[PDB]
């Protein structure tokens, strides 16, 4: 409603690089957009960008189970977008991931640290795109994709 599209990302990683230039194309082709700073509900789209840290952080994987169990109830749809992270990696918590939810699990409830694994699981099937020899290209593909997908 109050915004097309909510982005979800771990700041530390992409927020001046990649995140900057994918919000500068969104808010250029008038795509209005969410973006935090250093309305899940309220937003059309969810573009996640999830980067080599983002399941590093307990609080981007609380975002990202607000987000999917939003969209496993139709609130929301969830464009996924791989950077620096196999989605089969992303899929079985598999690769850095690997060591992320090792930390996870000496710190936090099992039954919570699953919930999280869930949501990656099935953030996973979704269908996405991925990091690959340009991300310039990626950035166009995603605004031009919203762009061609908002009412
Ligand atoms: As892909």
């Known amino acids: 409603t109050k915004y097309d599209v909510f982005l979800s990302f771990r700041g530390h990683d992409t927020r001046h690089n990649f995140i900057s230039f994918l919000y500068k194309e969104l808010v250029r082709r008038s795509i209005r957009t969410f973006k935090d700073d250093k309305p899940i509900e309220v937003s059309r ?7 080599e840290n983002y399941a590093a952080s307990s609080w981007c994987l609380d975002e990202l189970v607000t987000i999917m169990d939003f969209e496993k109830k139709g609130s929301i749809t969830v464009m996924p977008i791989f950077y620096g ?12 991931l690997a060591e992320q939810f090792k930390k996870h699990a000496s710190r936090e409830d099992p039954e919570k640290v699953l919930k999280w694994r869930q949501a990656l699981t099935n953030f996973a099937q979704l269908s996405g795109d991925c990091s690959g020899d340009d991300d310039s290209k990626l950035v166009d593909k995603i605004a031009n994709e919203i762009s061609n997908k908002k009412t």
């Open 45 to 51: 789209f969810a573009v996640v960008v999830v980067s």
């Open 85 to 96: 992270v196999e989605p089969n990696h992303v899929r079985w918590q598999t690769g850095v």
